Write a protein that binds this ligand. Structure first.
Ligand SMILES: Cc1cn([C@H]2C[C@H](OP(=O)(O)O)[C@@H](COP(=O)(O)O)O2)c(=O)[nH]c1=O
Ligand SMILES: [Ca+2]
Length: 137
């Protein structure tokens, strides 16, 4: 994979795994690859436990970053909702992994070929589960 040249700027973090960014001068909604943070918006699931916590975590991490970078995987770059599918980095730390390492997201929606960081993220999930962190508490 390679990060896209430069970085994006934050417009609005919507919840733990979805953020709107100004990416190449276009406002874009991005959904984080290979993770799921708990739901806070859609009424069918309601506000899931650790949903508020995952949102605050993502928001702080992207708001305090000097540099936000976007890395696409090898397959499709947008999902069926028109959301960009990427690994997002806040000063070179992957948000997707940070969330999983905190037990604030589960590794989910693994669709080949978009699975380059799947084993890295599953190792972080394993560590959060053996530490009983948050979702795994
Ligand atoms: C992360 C990811 C989600 N999605 C879809 C799967 C789910 O579709 P359905 O809504 O039809 O269940 C939804 C999960 O996103 P949310 O967690 O934002 O709801 O987004 C993809 O299509 N590809 C991806 O790589
Ligand atoms: Ca989610």
């Amino acid at each position: 994979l390679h990060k896209e040249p430069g970085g994006a700027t934050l417009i609005k973090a919507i919840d733990g795994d979805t953020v709107k960014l100004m990416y190449k001068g276009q406002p874009m909604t991005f959904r984080l690859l290979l993770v799921d943070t708990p739901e806070t918006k859609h009424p069918k699931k309601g506000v899931e436990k650790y949903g508020p916590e995952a949102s605050a975590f993502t928001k702080k991490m992207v708001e305090n970053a000097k540099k936000i970078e976007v890395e696409f995987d090898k397959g499709q770059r947008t999902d069926k909702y028109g959301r960009g599918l990427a690994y997002i980095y806040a000063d070179g730390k992957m948000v997707n992994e940070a969330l999983v390492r905190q037990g604030l997201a589960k590794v989910a929606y693994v669709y080949k070929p978009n699975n380059t960081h799947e084993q890295h993220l599953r190792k972080s999930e394993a560590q959060a589960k053996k530490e009983k962190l948050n979702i795994w508490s």
